[PDB]
Copies of this chain bind each other. A is one copy, B any other.
Amino acid sequence: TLWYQTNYVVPPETPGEAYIIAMGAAQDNFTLKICKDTDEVT
């Protein structure tokens, strides 16, 4: 989850709307087992 803590303050002559990009990856502990064909294709 990702919560508004206090506010989003902005000085005059500035747009008060921004964006946040989320990224994600695995780590060194990530291990995979049992091969299987995918299902994104038909």
Chain A residues in the interface with B (C-beta under 8 A): 12-15
Contact = CB atoms under 8 A, between A and B. Distances in A.
Contacts of A12: 13-15
Q: Which secondary structure dominates chain A's binding surface?
A: loop
Number of copies: 2
Contacts of A15: 12
A23 to B, nearest CB: 27
4 contacts: A12-B13, A12-B14, A12-B15, A13-B13
A12 B12 CA distance: 10
A40 B20 CA distance: 57
Nearest to A13: B13
> Closest 4 CB pairs between A and B?
A13-B13, A12-B13, A12-B14, A12-B15
